[PDB]
Amino acid sequence: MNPPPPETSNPNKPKRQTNQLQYLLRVVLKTLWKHQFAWPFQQPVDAVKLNLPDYYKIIKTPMDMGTIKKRLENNYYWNAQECIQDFNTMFTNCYIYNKPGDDIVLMAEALEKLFLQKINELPT
Ligand code: NA
User: Fold this and answer.
1) Which stretches make up the Bromo domain?
2) Gap from CA of 96 to ligand 1 centroid (Å)
3) Which site in 39, 41, 106, 124 is 20 to 30 Å from 48, CA atoms measured?
């Protein structure tokens, strides 16, 4: 009843390593990954275990930090903006599905605040 997770590697997609991508993996993602609030974002939303039958009726573009982490480790991204887009998908899904002041939303907002600070420090 869960959808398959987003793809995290693709043999047909060109690959490269850049400073911005190495920074996204070794600084931005690590920082968020080890945050007190990271657990619910470390894997795709499991609508079965969470008992959310409408999650994937509302959320059609799922994203999560476990997928982002794999995509980085697998050199899935060609540029930093693809990865930043995935983070904003993850956050935006949370804010769309949930309500203001929900525990998961407040947790999302703290991680996004942190993400935004690290993304402001992106190497050129
Ligand atoms: Na909302």
Assistant:
1) 16-122
2) 4
3) 106
